[PDB]
């Protein structure tokens, strides 16, 4: 089987710095249940893309 | 036959018309499908394992549709029609020997160098007659053309009678001078045989020829005794074998390619071509563009072949589904 | 019309002649298509005699 | 006259139409072929070497159609009327300098932007009228601008009579009081010229100005003692040097594109547009969109002249037939 995936971002959130950040909570590999926060959108959208 | 593709071509048998997705009792029944508001097309076909559909085509994404007869795919077989020349004389000449020679272009290589020629001779008489000189001419080449140990059938040889002017007299390497009994023969004719024929090992082909000439003296000096014309072909090779290799190409894009590559563990497609029949085309060309960037088209092909009776109905009925559901336009042939 | 206006241009401003200029080209700042172009000129010669 | 293009623009000259291919005879002969199902459109045009034929124009593909009247790429001449307002005085003042300035926007042989001005002295005494103003004024005008010393003036100079009202009475570097005896003088006008035009060097080209009146003081007050209005024309400049550059700049998309600067080892084309005529155009804008992923446009035109006899016969005609053949819908002029 055969999958696929896709995300488009304007190119103008380059280093666009988040005001107040996002807090999240993200999995590690195993010793997951880390709380992070994103500073940049794109690490949050690098993070759900994967 | 390997085929050449605009990224896809798809194939449907549509052995019967239903009206109705419920009304797909047996294999080949077919069903055009498009909403009333016409933005999509596709076709409910009934397989050899159940229902099954095709792909949507988008009406606003419609290249070419259009519906091919059988007589388009017959192929015209060449026959040429070749005399002596009156101009070096109008009969035979005393004591020459005249060799036909027929060189074969396409022969069991692809290439155009893979040639062949076989020849004719007769060496003329004193009192001999055209007529009988075709004869003889006619006969020798039965030996060496319609024989029974050539490997593959290469030609047809014939003969007319000025009386007949349309029938062909066959010579076969079992005819004589004696069962060709008339003296107006006017002519040999030399056609092109049908070349056999397998599913999806051998595809429908043919072996070209022209016929070439010795010279002879006539006076002094060497010259040309014949005249090699081509005459409007009168058998043709129906379309049965063509879309049965279309299918076993076709059904690949849908399906199973290994066709037979790992025999006991293999997976069968059965089909529903017979190749004792004459089958009408119809294709439909049409393309896929996406969203904000992603407009490159993805060119496409959907084709429906149905029997025809002699009159076009299976098609012609097929096509007047597909232009009531569509609003298409396909020019019943 | 650009600039924010809200009544339009008098015609009298619209007549044969009115000269016109670049100014610039400006887009969004989020999926902006391409705009513009650049331009070019020839040259003249003279020639004298000894 | 360089143009700017869309990636290319053609232009043939449709100096008679005929019905058929057959009847291509004559240079500038032309018929638009479209086949019945219209799905391409093309021009067969006779050149100086044998019929050409334009690039076929895809019928689903054509972004616009339009044509030209020859009276919209025609440019009229402007002309002001100059006189002094009877606000400051209706007639002059003894002792004071009048000095009319003509702001031009470029110099004489080149086309940028720049403020370029000529001047028109005349002292005024105690019996000074307003005719002999003008006239003194006229005639400094006429020293001043008609100084070329090679071609023409930069503009025209004249003078109204009020008996005439209508009469412009010319005003030469050569001119003097004495041929000018008149009493009744009113206003001087003041027309734009027609410039030197080479066939591919120099574009043709005005040079738009406006009269500046210095001061004088009256009373004490420096003022502006002028009244530049702009009178309608009556004079224009056609398009037949305008097209003919078109021809010369567009043949050089399908013919050679160096045209004389290897002077002795050279290519020379034959131009049919016929400047002192004058053309009714036509364009179809049209593009080449391409297979699988090969989307990108490549947009075209193809310009078609005709010369105007008034009403616009003959290329009414040249688009009935297009609309004939393509079954476009173009308007006629």
Known sequence: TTIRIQHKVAGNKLNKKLAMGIPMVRNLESGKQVKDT???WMHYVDWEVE | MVISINQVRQLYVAKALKANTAALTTAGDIVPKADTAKTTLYFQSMSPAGIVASDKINLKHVLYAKATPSEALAHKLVRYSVTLDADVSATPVAGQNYILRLAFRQYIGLSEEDQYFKYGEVIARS??????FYKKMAISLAKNLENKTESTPL??????????????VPVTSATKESDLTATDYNQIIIEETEQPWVLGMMPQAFIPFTPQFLTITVDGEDRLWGVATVVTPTKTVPDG???????????????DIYRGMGYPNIIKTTYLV????????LDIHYFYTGSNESVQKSEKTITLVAVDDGSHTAMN????????????????? | ??????????????QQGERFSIEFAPVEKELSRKVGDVRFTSPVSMRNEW
């Open chain 2, 241 to 255: 074998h063509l879309i049965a290799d279309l299918e076993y190409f076709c059904m690949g894009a849908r399906g």
């Open chain 2, 127 to 132: 009192g001999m007659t055209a007529s009988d």
């Open chain 1, 38 to 40: 994103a500073n940049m």
């Open chain 2, 274 to 281: 017979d190749p004792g029949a004459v089958y009408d085309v």
């Open chain 2, 317 to 333: 009925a097929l096509i007047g589904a597909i232009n009531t559901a569509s609003g298409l336009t396909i020019a019943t042939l």
């Open chain 2, 155 to 168: 030609v047809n040889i014939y003969l007319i009678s000025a009386a007949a002017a349309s029938t062909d």
């Open chain 3, 1 to 14: 019309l650009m600039g924010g206006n809200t009544q339009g241009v008098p015609a009298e401003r619209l």
